[PDB]
Design a protein that fits this description.
By secondary structure, this protein is mostly helical. The chain has five helices and no strands. The radius of gyration is 24 Å and the shape is elongated. It binds one DNA strand through helix 5.
DNA sequence: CTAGCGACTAATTTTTCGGTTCACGGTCCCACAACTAACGAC
Protein backbone atom coordinates (compact mmCIF):
# COMPACT_ATOMS: atom_id res chain seq x y z
CA UNK A 1 0.00 0.00 0.00
CA UNK A 2 2.78 2.44 0.90
CA UNK A 3 4.72 1.70 -2.28
CA UNK A 4 1.59 2.09 -4.42
CA UNK A 5 0.77 5.39 -2.71
CA UNK A 6 3.99 6.88 -4.15
CA UNK A 7 3.95 8.59 -7.54
CA UNK A 8 6.85 9.00 -9.95
CA UNK A 9 8.63 12.33 -10.37
CA UNK A 10 8.57 11.75 -14.13
CA UNK A 11 4.81 12.39 -14.03
CA UNK A 12 5.68 16.09 -13.65
CA UNK A 13 7.34 17.36 -16.82
CA UNK A 14 10.68 19.09 -16.23
CA UNK A 15 10.45 18.27 -12.54
CA UNK A 16 14.20 18.87 -12.17
CA UNK A 17 13.66 22.51 -13.17
CA UNK A 18 11.03 23.67 -10.67
CA UNK A 19 10.90 20.96 -7.98
CA UNK A 20 13.17 19.27 -5.42
CA UNK A 21 14.73 22.53 -4.26
CA UNK A 22 16.56 23.86 -1.24
CA UNK A 23 17.92 27.16 0.08
CA UNK A 24 21.44 27.34 1.59
CA UNK A 25 20.23 30.03 4.01
CA UNK A 26 18.46 27.28 5.96
CA UNK A 27 21.68 25.25 6.19
CA UNK A 28 23.70 28.25 7.36
CA UNK A 29 21.03 29.08 9.95
CA UNK A 30 21.07 25.50 11.22
CA UNK A 31 24.85 25.59 11.58
CA UNK A 32 24.61 28.95 13.38
CA UNK A 33 22.09 27.45 15.81
CA UNK A 34 24.47 24.53 16.37
CA UNK A 35 27.30 26.98 17.11
CA UNK A 36 25.07 28.84 19.58
CA UNK A 37 24.28 25.59 21.39
CA UNK A 38 27.97 24.67 21.46
CA UNK A 39 28.86 28.07 22.92
CA UNK A 40 26.21 27.65 25.62
CA UNK A 41 27.58 24.21 26.50
CA UNK A 42 31.14 25.60 26.63
CA UNK A 43 29.91 28.31 29.01
CA UNK A 44 28.37 25.60 31.20
CA UNK A 45 31.57 23.55 31.11
CA UNK A 46 33.58 26.61 32.16
CA UNK A 47 31.15 27.21 35.03
CA UNK A 48 31.40 23.57 36.18
CA UNK A 49 34.81 23.79 37.97
CA UNK A 50 33.47 26.60 40.17
CA UNK A 51 30.97 24.21 41.79
CA UNK A 52 31.55 21.87 44.71
CA UNK A 53 33.50 18.75 43.80
CA UNK A 54 30.69 16.30 44.59
CA UNK A 55 28.16 18.27 42.54
CA UNK A 56 30.67 18.61 39.70
CA UNK A 57 31.27 14.86 39.57
CA UNK A 58 27.52 14.25 39.73
CA UNK A 59 27.06 16.36 36.59
CA UNK A 60 30.10 14.87 34.85
CA UNK A 61 28.77 11.35 35.40
CA UNK A 62 25.29 12.49 34.35
CA UNK A 63 26.83 13.74 31.09
CA UNK A 64 28.63 10.51 30.18
CA UNK A 65 26.05 7.96 31.33
CA UNK A 66 22.99 10.17 31.61
CA UNK A 67 20.60 10.99 34.45
CA UNK A 68 20.83 7.38 35.66
CA UNK A 69 19.78 8.02 39.24
CA UNK A 70 19.78 4.31 40.10
CA UNK A 71 23.23 3.34 38.84
CA UNK A 72 24.63 6.62 40.17
CA UNK A 73 23.09 6.05 43.61
CA UNK A 74 24.70 2.61 43.95
CA UNK A 75 27.95 4.11 42.65
CA UNK A 76 27.81 6.96 45.17
CA UNK A 77 26.23 5.55 48.33
CA UNK A 78 23.30 7.92 48.58
CA UNK A 79 19.84 6.58 47.80
CA UNK A 80 17.70 7.30 44.77
CA UNK A 81 15.98 10.14 46.63
CA UNK A 82 19.17 11.72 47.99
CA UNK A 83 20.97 11.42 44.65
CA UNK A 84 18.05 12.96 42.77
CA UNK A 85 17.92 15.80 45.30
CA UNK A 86 21.65 16.48 44.90
CA UNK A 87 21.36 16.45 41.10
C1' DC B 1 59.10 66.35 72.97
C1' DT B 2 55.11 64.42 76.28
C1' DA B 3 51.27 64.50 78.89
C1' DG B 4 46.68 66.84 80.60
C1' DC B 5 42.45 68.80 78.90
C1' DG B 6 38.25 70.81 76.52
C1' DA B 7 6.67 13.30 44.29
C1' DC B 8 10.14 11.24 41.17
C1' DT B 9 12.17 7.06 39.54
C1' DA B 10 12.38 2.12 38.59
C1' DA B 11 10.15 -2.32 37.85
C1' DT B 12 6.60 -5.09 35.85
C1' DT B 13 2.58 -5.93 32.87
C1' DT B 14 -0.60 -5.71 28.81
C1' DT B 15 -2.27 -5.00 24.40
C1' DT B 16 -2.85 -3.73 18.52
C1' DC B 17 -0.68 -4.73 14.28
C1' DG B 18 2.15 -7.48 11.31
C1' DG B 19 3.86 -12.05 10.13
C1' DT B 20 2.83 -16.66 9.00
C1' DT B 21 0.12 -20.54 7.23
C1' DC B 22 -3.58 -23.22 4.62
C1' DA B 23 -4.02 -24.21 0.20
C1' DC B 24 -10.29 -28.10 -5.96
C1' DG B 25 -14.47 -28.78 -8.48
C1' DG B 26 3.13 9.58 -37.42
C1' DT B 27 7.30 10.97 -40.85
C1' DC B 28 11.62 10.63 -42.81
C1' DC B 29 16.01 8.58 -42.82
C1' DC B 30 19.84 5.07 -42.26
C1' DA B 31 21.22 0.28 -41.41
C1' DC B 32 20.61 -4.89 -40.97
C1' DA B 33 18.74 -9.44 -42.10
C1' DA B 34 16.25 -12.25 -45.83
C1' DC B 35 16.06 -13.42 -50.09
C1' DT B 36 15.76 -14.40 -54.73
C1' DA B 37 16.56 -14.10 -59.64
C1' DA B 38 20.27 -14.47 -62.55
C1' DC B 39 25.19 -15.97 -63.46
C1' DG B 40 29.24 -18.87 -63.46
C1' DA B 41 31.75 -23.37 -62.24
C1' DC B 42 32.09 -28.71 -61.72
Amino acid sequence: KFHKKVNSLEDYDNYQDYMVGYDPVNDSENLDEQESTQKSFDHIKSILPLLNADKRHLIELCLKYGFQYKAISKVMGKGIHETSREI
